Design a protein around this ligand. Sequence first.
Ligand SMILES: CCCCCCCCCCCCCCCCCC(=O)OC[C@H](COP(=O)([O-])OCC(O)COP(=O)([O-])OC[C@@H](COC(=O)CCCCCCCCCCCCCCCCC)OC(=O)CCCCCCCCCCCCCCCCC)OC(=O)CCCCCCCCCCCCCCCCC
Ligand SMILES: CCCCCCCCCCCCCCCCCC(=O)OC[C@H](COP(=O)([O-])OCC(O)COP(=O)([O-])OC[C@@H](COC(=O)CCCCCCCCCCCCCCCCC)OC(=O)CCCCCCCCCCCCCCCCC)OC(=O)CCCCCCCCCCCCCCCCC
Ligand SMILES: CCCCCCCCCCCCCCCCCC(=O)OC[C@H](COP(=O)([O-])OCC(O)COP(=O)([O-])OC[C@@H](COC(=O)CCCCCCCCCCCCCCCCC)OC(=O)CCCCCCCCCCCCCCCCC)OC(=O)CCCCCCCCCCCCCCCCC
Ligand SMILES: CCCCCCCCCCCCCCCCCC(=O)O[C@@H](COC(=O)CCCCCCCCCCCCCCC)COP(=O)(O)OCC[N+](C)(C)C
Ligand SMILES: CCCCCCCCCCCCCCCCCCCC(=O)O[C@H](COC(=O)CCCCCCCCCCCCCC)COP(=O)(O)OCCN
Lengths: 82, 250, 226, 51, 205, 80, 308
Amino acid sequence: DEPKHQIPGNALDNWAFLRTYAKPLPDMIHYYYYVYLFGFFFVYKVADFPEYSPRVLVMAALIGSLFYVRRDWVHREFKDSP
Amino acid sequence: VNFYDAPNGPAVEQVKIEDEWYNRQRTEFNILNKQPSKADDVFIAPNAVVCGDVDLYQKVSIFFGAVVRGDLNTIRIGENSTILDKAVVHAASTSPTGLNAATIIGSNVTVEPHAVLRSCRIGDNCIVGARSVVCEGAIMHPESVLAPGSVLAPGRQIPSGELWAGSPAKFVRKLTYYETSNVIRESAEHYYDIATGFRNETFDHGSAWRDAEAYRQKLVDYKEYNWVNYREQKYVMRLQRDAAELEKLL
Amino acid sequence: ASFLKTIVWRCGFAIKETGLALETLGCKLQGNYSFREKCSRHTPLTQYQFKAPSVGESTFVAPSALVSGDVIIGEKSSVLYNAVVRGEFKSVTIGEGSTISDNAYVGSSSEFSPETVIGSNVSVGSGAVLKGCTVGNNVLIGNNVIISEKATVEDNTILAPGSYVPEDVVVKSGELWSGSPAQKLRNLDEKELALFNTLSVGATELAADHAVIMKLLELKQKEFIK
Amino acid sequence: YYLGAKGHTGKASAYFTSFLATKSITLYHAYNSADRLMGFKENSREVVKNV
Amino acid sequence: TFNYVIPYGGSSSYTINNEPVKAEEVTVDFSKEPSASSLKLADKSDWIAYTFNNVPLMATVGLLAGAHEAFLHYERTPIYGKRTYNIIKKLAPIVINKTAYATLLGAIFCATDALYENYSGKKSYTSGMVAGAATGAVFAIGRPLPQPLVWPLVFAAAPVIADLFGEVYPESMKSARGYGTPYGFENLDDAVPTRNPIRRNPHHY
Amino acid sequence: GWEYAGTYGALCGMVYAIGSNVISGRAWFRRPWVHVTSVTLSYLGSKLLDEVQDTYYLEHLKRVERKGLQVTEEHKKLFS
Amino acid sequence: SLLKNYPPSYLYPFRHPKPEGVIEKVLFNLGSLFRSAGQGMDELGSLMLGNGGMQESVGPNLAYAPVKYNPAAAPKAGIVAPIPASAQRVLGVKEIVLPSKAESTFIAPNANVLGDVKIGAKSSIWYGAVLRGDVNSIEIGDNTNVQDNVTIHVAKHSIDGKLRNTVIGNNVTIGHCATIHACTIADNVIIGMGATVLDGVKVESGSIVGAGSIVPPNTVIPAGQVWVGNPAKFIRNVLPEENGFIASSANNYDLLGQQHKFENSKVFEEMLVEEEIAKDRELLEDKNLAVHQLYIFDPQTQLAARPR
Ligand SMILES: CCCCCCCCCCCCCCCCCC(=O)OC[C@H](COP(=O)([O-])OCC(O)COP(=O)([O-])OC[C@@H](COC(=O)CCCCCCCCCCCCCCCCC)OC(=O)CCCCCCCCCCCCCCCCC)OC(=O)CCCCCCCCCCCCCCCCC
Ligand SMILES: CCCCCCCCCCCCCCCCCC(=O)OC[C@H](COP(=O)([O-])OCC(O)COP(=O)([O-])OC[C@@H](COC(=O)CCCCCCCCCCCCCCCCC)OC(=O)CCCCCCCCCCCCCCCCC)OC(=O)CCCCCCCCCCCCCCCCC
Ligand SMILES: CCCCCCCCCCCCCCCCCC(=O)OC[C@H](COP(=O)([O-])OCC(O)COP(=O)([O-])OC[C@@H](COC(=O)CCCCCCCCCCCCCCCCC)OC(=O)CCCCCCCCCCCCCCCCC)OC(=O)CCCCCCCCCCCCCCCCC
Ligand SMILES: CCCCCCCCCCCCCCCCCC(=O)O[C@@H](COC(=O)CCCCCCCCCCCCCCC)COP(=O)(O)OCC[N+](C)(C)C
Ligand SMILES: CCCCCCCCCCCCCCCCCCCC(=O)O[C@H](COC(=O)CCCCCCCCCCCCCC)COP(=O)(O)OCCN
């Protein structure tokens, strides 16, 4: 026997939390199609954007990073409900 | 006699042992659908015989006189495991215990000369002594040693970190930390060095084929040598066998 | 020195390897593929680098036997069929009149093995495993006896079949030993004491007959080759 | 020949490869000579040889 | 120096100065000067005008983030099953709230920056740090204990990075050329150019 | 250019032969013919790479002189 | 087969037919020069290599090997055969005893069977087994399996008249690495792996001798008993199902011997052809190859069987 890390939580509760990731998985082409199209149009529009201060650009990048939701997070938490 | 459903086909010409004028034994050869697999650094002695579904991992050494027959079931020899002289490793079709009957040998396992292993699980860093018999379904757990002249009866177990001896093998002493950590691995490394040496002075096609080539050339010069399309003959023999099997009434 | 001998061996081996490769290339150009033959490449007297088995004139070494490394075999000794005598790592010495029987292993190939010494009129049984041990004159070893490293067998002794000799265990003269832990059973009676030389000479006679037959086999092979 | 013998067709591969490479290099040389005649490339030997 | 007796490096006389000498005889520039739109947006005189000019960036970023999340939800909803609830009623709050909160954070940042620069009267690191600190404080109003500290620090650190590598870095290394003679060392005998290298034209995309 | 290119190439041919033997599980001395071939081809290749580098160095010097870089005779000596 | 235009090198990989084109003839002569130069370089290298020169030769076939015939002691199990006349004027032996085996018997090329050995049909002598009948006869019955590295030995009867021949009955299994000296084994007996059976031992039918057990000399193991130990002692009686195991082991090793005999008995040219069969089987595993669109290949021999 060896000293081991204590695992917080009950075994069955943690397994139940992990089982909430087993949901119908959409194929990634649907996201990719829209991202490609809107990205092409976006790159066309960017050349017309006004020149922004570097400070504002960095703050916008920080806000976007904070606001970005990982695709797995929506996967676990999605409910087909109002 | 002739296996007509053999993977490479039936044998067009079969020669009797009386008619052989030289030893034609192959150190690695295929028994029907079962093919032995070997790594680049695996040493098989010229005397040694390896047949059947035997998988040889990297740094496996098969020394002189050892027979590893993988005809009934699968044999796996782990990394840096050495089968020493005249030691037989064989596999049973079924095991008495009811578990898998394959002969699985772990890493850094030294099987000392004339030791017989049949359908046993040998754990990593184990030593089987000289003239030690491990029977079907017997499992040696890792870091265990069987003393020379000892028998593990079918379905028996040797626990880890223990030295076992006797014809009804019994516990003798607990192996020390230094032993299990170093010496068992070191023996396999030493025999790997010996086998590496033997490999380094081995030619790819040693000059023993010249003697048979002399006879073949003499036959060619005297016009008795015959050119046989074995592929076509195999095809024709299989066709004839199928036609006859259709014709038969009983 | 040893380094000079190693360099000489490497140079000669490179030359021989290149010569064999060129011969194989010539065979490939001619369309002959006999070099691909997987036949028994076993040699009864193999050498490891410059260490080669020294062998006597009256000795019989079986074709299936393997005498490997620097093994000195004295006159009127016999290594019988499928017997493995390994002396690469440490040398092995066999005395006059000594017999190594079928399927017997005598070697000094473990890392810490002492040099194996076998005395005169010593018969090793069929199946016995001898590793790094000293055996004295006129000793009868059983069929399946295991003798471990550094163990010593004194003169005029018989080891019963199946006995295992632990290391640093001295088997004393005029005695009979047996058991997985070898222990003295009885003192040898006079008849067994006299029997040793008769056994050795009978083995020598049998070896001479086998040598005649082996020569017959070699002539039959010569007829095919030439 | 060396590559085709690995596929048991040495002679045909040898002739095909010879014809192929010879045709390509001959066209390269002819293009260079035509450029020399057109005056694009150096032509002192050409003008001397054929006035 | 490479010795243990006298100090390493060297010193330059402050009294002695070296006359500037041109890196090349004729200077051709492929770097375009700032546009009037860039100077307009950078102008922080009127804090309301500065805020309203620079918020469209923040609103855009919030709209992309909300669109990403809303599409992740939409992709999951089943077309084959008819749904009792209205999908856009579910999805519109996502995008609208993300965009609004992003715009609010960017507005606090820009307004505090302009107000501090006007009150201080100087362009400094401190304006960006204070605007970021306020924005990160607004980010962590009701959040658990580490976050009241970490978000003001991160949001303040971001303008420091922007100032350090967007303004100080370019201005520190304007003189260094890479061709001809080293900027400090013109006495050394290196090949002197008639014209500077033009590795690319002024861009127009 | 480099004055030690050929020696380097021969040593690197040795590197090829020995490494190829070691990767395949063979000892360094195995397949002796590969050693000679590797050494000779690697030496020739290292030389050829050096002349190629020198030639394009000189082409760049000609181009920059045409463009207006006032290279001196000593600077012209730097490019062989 | 479907096609008859296959290249001759493809049809005869072991030895290409005589060169017919000029280029082929030149290649043949160049190969001859290369062969001679390579042999010369081989000998020069062998000089440096020292005593032995790492020379290699073909080994004799000892699976069917003779022993000197004794006019006093006539052969009992094996047959006696004359030897070639030239060997007669060299060696001087008139006749030599040869082993006697049935056609169904499988003897491994590694195994050494010598002299007075009679082996029955469907019996198998496996790899490394040494069967010496130089002094006295050895008899092995039908469906009897002498496994790997087994040594069977005999001695002379001597003044007492004690029978020192080795008689092994039918359906007998001798385990790997077992040593059997001049003993008698009855039918349907399993000898364990590593077991030593000494002189005078009679093992009755239906018995099992345990692995690594030395049965003492002149000991009778009675029928239907299991004996194990260094001084082999009785432990239990054979269970009724264990008898069916004894028979099943004998039959399974008969099938095993048939397979191994089939593999070993192929000639070289057939073995090399089969190696090429395996190789182009591996190359033809890709089913998107152009040739697969052309033809369907026979599975056992990858020859074009029918067009696709
Ligand atoms: C209707 C269609 C739906 C889409 C709508 C939009 C359609 C597109 C329109 C136009 C698209 C072009 C512009 C969009 C952005 C370009 C990205 C893209 O297209 O790639 C294809 C991408 C899919 O590609 P993929 O290969 O399948 O996914 C790879 C991932 O592994 C995906 O797997 P994952 O999601 O499971 O894993 C995500 C992972 C992936 O990693 C990333 O996201 C990398 C993003 C890093 C920044 C990207 C470079 C930023 C430079 C911006 C340049 C402009 C400003 C210039 C100056 C800025 C200086 C930095 O990141 C994370 O783990 C989560 C954190 C996210 C940011 C991580 C950085 C955190 C820093 C904050 C520190 C604070 C913490 C302190 C406390 C910590 C305590 C210890 O599609 C999109 O994601 C587009 C979604 C649009 C939402 C973006 C929202 C803001 C956009 C602008 C802000 C820029 C910041 C970027 C945020 C994250 C963007 C991914
Ligand atoms: C560094 C900075 C970086 C900057 C840029 C770097 C540059 C980048 C590029 C550089 C790339 C370098 C790295 C790649 C290296 C290339 C790879 C490589 O090493 O070879 C791979 C390749 C791999 O061979 P492998 O591993 O066995 O696999 C092929 C299989 O066999 C497959 O079997 P196969 O069916 O395909 O068989 C075809 C082939 C493959 O077959 C073989 O390879 C089997 C072996 C060939 C026969 C043995 C060669 C006999 C001469 C070898 C000398 C070794 C000396 C050592 C022992 C000393 C003995 C006294 O057969 C051939 O050898 C074709 C060549 C024909 C020549 C055959 C020999 C002619 C007779 C000798 C001519 C002259 C004799 C004078 C003196 C002779 C005694 C010293 O090696 C060869 O194919 C060898 C071809 C040449 C044989 C050596 C001939 C040398 C001439 C004798 C030495 C005289 C002095 C040399 C100067 C004067 C020249 C005349
Ligand atoms: C002309 C007359 C002749 C005179 C002689 C003059 C000839 C000149 C030199 C020729 C000598 C032959 C060169 C050796 C060839 C084979 C070397 C080798 O296989 O390595 C291990 C090999 C022994 O390994 P092994 O037990 O036989 O088993 C290897 C198995 O294949 C795989 O075993 P494993 O699967 O268990 O892998 C376990 C692995 C654990 O896994 C790892 O750690 C992998 C890590 C990735 C690589 C390591 C990254 C760091 C390496 C730093 C370089 C070391 C030098 C540091 C000096 C700073 C240089 C800037 O541990 C190791 O393998 C050993 C760890 C330390 C060795 C790492 C150094 C190897 C660098 C690359 C080797 C060259 C391969 C060329 C390929 C040729 C065509 C195939 O050699 C050694 O005994 C020690 C390495 C000797 C290093 C010399 C190689 C030169 C590299 C320096 C770069 C400088 C540029 C090259 C210029 C060279 C002079 C012109
Ligand atoms: C030394 C100069 C003269 C060399 C003589 C050759 C000149 C003949 C004209 C050129 C023909 C091709 C040259 C041979 C190169 C490779 C040929 C080849 O692959 O060799 C063998 C097999 O491949 C090999 O063995 C590898 C050999 C590699 C090269 C080794 C020879 C090196 C010298 C030859 C080339 C030197 C230059 C040729 C003239 C410029 C071919 O097998 P097969 O197709 O079955 O033909 C043999 C005919 N038959 C079996 C029926 C007898
Ligand atoms: C990679 C650098 C990122 C900084 C990491 C610091 C630790 C992160 C913690 C987050 C805290 C927010 C960031 C604050 C760092 C700035 C240092 C404060 C010093 C300070 O207040 O002076 C200002 C100038 O320093 C400045 O603002 C410019 C100094 C540049 C920061 C230090 C650069 C080296 C630090 C690297 C440490 C190791 C790297 C590992 C992160 C004012 O100046 P003023 O002009 O406004 O005068 C005032 C007239 N009103």
